[PDB]
Design a protein around this nucleic acid. Structure first.
Lengths: 312, 312
DNA sequence: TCAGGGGAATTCCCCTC
DNA sequence: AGAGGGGAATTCCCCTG
């Protein structure tokens, strides 16, 4: 039967979540292949069905238990945190550009979560899957307006109080839900929604972009233990590593880490370290290796920089 | 007649202002001559008068107009921002230890300021000097009993709205006011108040501590621009200078600033720059020069570190 | 501009005596 | 095991191109 397939996922890292105070129009959530000039965006595709339909996007949690996220989606076609756009009549592919991720305050988690749960219940956008199964009977029953009862508000507040202590404000996910038309033509037939890759805030120190801005000495001796200063982006002294590596044997790898202490990490932006020992200390020609910044917890690679080992 | 003399002023820089959230036990305001083990505190002395008296201390602003400051003084003898202590019979020496400077939020400045202005009018603590000259008639009538009128509250609120946007939250001053007894014995005869030195918050980037944490090359050549990386504390790229200096017996004033661009200042904590040319390029012996970080606005001295120029 | 980025203000938490 | 600081994370502000 018909389903929804994510053609291009959003970029997991590099995007910066912004609060209401930071202002508007600061960038759109880019695609996984959104290099400079080759600006791409998250794309989905409704398969096994040809014709006009609608696609909604909502923010969900990163944990095993999928639930609504207090963060919102801001931009055009987005109202109250949900972005709704009509798919092409023939191009069953849908792209999402100019999507910002509104970061909520920790104190304003409960308030925003409850408000957007109320919205998701009045609009019937997967009420039982994200809030609570007790309200999984509101699959757009009726046309348009769907006033809520008193017990339904009770369930909303119960789900909100329980999901406040379990929400990571630094990571979100995209849930794409497709809606196929019915008899009257209104988009109401809901197929299985699909969750996107995890989206990590750039303001989170454990998931930012690892970049080697500058190095004082770009070429050391094959012996090693030479002091080098590396100016970098924001890194955590207890969760940072400087890795020299070279591809060898056409398949094999050579690693080697700089010997530095967390005290040598100067205020998250600079590291004074010492070069490790190379393989062939009895080398004859200067060998070329790459250097990167690797997070010990995430094992995330920084963009490598050239480095050279010279004999003595 | 009798006056009040500040024996030891507080240390102008080095102390960090703290908000209500940061807690209570983060340090006491040290004196200008304080050091480790030699723990000193701001002290004053009532001169030309022997006997019991009273000394109050209040926070005032730095600027042309001396006025109450939204920041408060926290501690034992301090209540609602004013620290009152009896000089004791025949002691006449007054010390002020365990004094913290409560940093208020920008949003809650006005609320606090007006709240402390009314108090200064109800208690008669220099109302015309600190609040507004129109209220320079509020002395000695009552120490709490004298409720204020409506026009007085209008003047207080006007002074508060005008001085909220005119207050520097990063610098304060201490005002000591002495009170001699009268016939009935109540301390009400006000002596001339004395203002202390300016106290600059260490967490303010324009008044922080200038420290040379690390240098890539600690000895360069007299030839000229050699690139060296300097790891430092928080400095402002548009208001920072790297000064090479040497005191000599022939006038002994040689200045010379490192050739760096504000772009070379890596995230306020590192500067990649080039050493300037010293005098006597045709030297024969290695000459020693010292290095500092000098703030462009304040011309404040950093802790010097050794450096040397060798010929070619 | 809209797309970013740096940095300041504010809150929270850890390291060394 | 706690005060004194200091660093780091979380929100907020606004400058640049």
């Amino acid at each position: 039967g018909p389903y929804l397939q994510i053609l291009e996922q959003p970029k997991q890292r590099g995007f910066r979540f912004r609060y209401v105070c930071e202002g508007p129009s600061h960038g759109g959530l880019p695609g996984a292949s959104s290099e400079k000039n080759k600006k791409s965006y998250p794309q989905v595709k409704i398969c096994n069905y040809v014709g006009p339909a609608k696609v909604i996007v909502q923010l969900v949690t990163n944990g095993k238990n999928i639930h609504l996220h207090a963060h919102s989606l801001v931009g055009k076609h987005c109202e109250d945190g949900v972005c709704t756009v009509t798919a092409g009549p023939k191009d069953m592919v849908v792209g999402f550009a100019n999507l910002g991720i509104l970061h909520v305050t920790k104190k304003k988690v409960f308030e925003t979560l409850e408000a957007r749960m109320t919205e998701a219940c009045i609009r019937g956008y997967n009420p039982g899957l994200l809030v609570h199964s007790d309200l999984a009977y509101l699959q757009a029953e009726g046309g348009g307006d769907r006033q809520l009862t008193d017990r339904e508000k009770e369930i909303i507040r119960q789900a909100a109080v329980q999901q406040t202590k379990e929400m990571d404000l630094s990571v979100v996910r995209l849930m794409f839900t497709a809606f196929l038309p019915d008899s009257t033509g209104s988009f109401t037939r809901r197929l299985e929604p699909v969750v996107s890759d995890a989206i990590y805030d750039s303001k989170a120190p454990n998931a930012s972009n690892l970049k080697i801005v500058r190095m004082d000495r770009t070429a050391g001796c094959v012996t090693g233990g030479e002091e080098i200063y590396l100016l970098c982006d924001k890194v955590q002294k207890d969760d940072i590593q400087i890795r020299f590596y070279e591809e060898e044997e056409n398949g094999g790898v050579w690693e080697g880490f700089g010997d530095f202490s967390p005290t040598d990490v100067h205020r998250q932006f600079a590291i004074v370290f010492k070069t490790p020992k190379y393989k062939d200390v009895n080398i004859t020609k200067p060998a070329s290796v790459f250097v990167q910044l690797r997070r010990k917890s995430d094992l995330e690679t920084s963009e490598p920089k050239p480095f050279l080992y010279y004999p003595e």
